[PDB]
């Protein structure tokens, strides 16, 4: 069921009477980016790998040395 594109996932489910085939142009979302449909990739190498979008809060000192002149 993850292979069912959104819009149809709602039409299939009795949410909207009109399919995204027959929807008006104005009800469609405006996208400035290319649409990429990707189903669920669990159990595969394409499973989502979570991570921290941040870096460590405390930055350490990069040691640099000085001579006793």
């Amino acid at each position: 069921m993850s292979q069912v594109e959104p819009g149809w996932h709602f039409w299939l489910g009795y949410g909207v009477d009109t399919a995204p085939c027959n929807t008006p142009k104005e009800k469609l979302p405006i996208r400035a980016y290319p649409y990429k449909f990707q189903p669920n990739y669990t159990g595969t190498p394409g499973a989502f790998v979570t991570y921290n979008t941040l870096k460590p809060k405390i930055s350490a000192w990069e040691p640099v040395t000085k001579q006793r002149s």
Binding site: M1, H9, F10, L12, G13, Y14, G15
Partner: protein, 57 residues
Amino acid sequence: RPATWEESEEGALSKATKYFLLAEMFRGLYVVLEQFFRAPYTIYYPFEKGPVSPRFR
């Protein structure tokens, strides 16, 4: 007050027939059988989805 076996508007043989022939039990059997000839409610899920609303979370 409770009703005794006297003060009964039902003869002994009639209620004994209902006792030995299992009247209500055959009636329940028939009410179950009537459902055998009615439309099953089952939706085939991966191919037909259930009802979803705009409010769904």
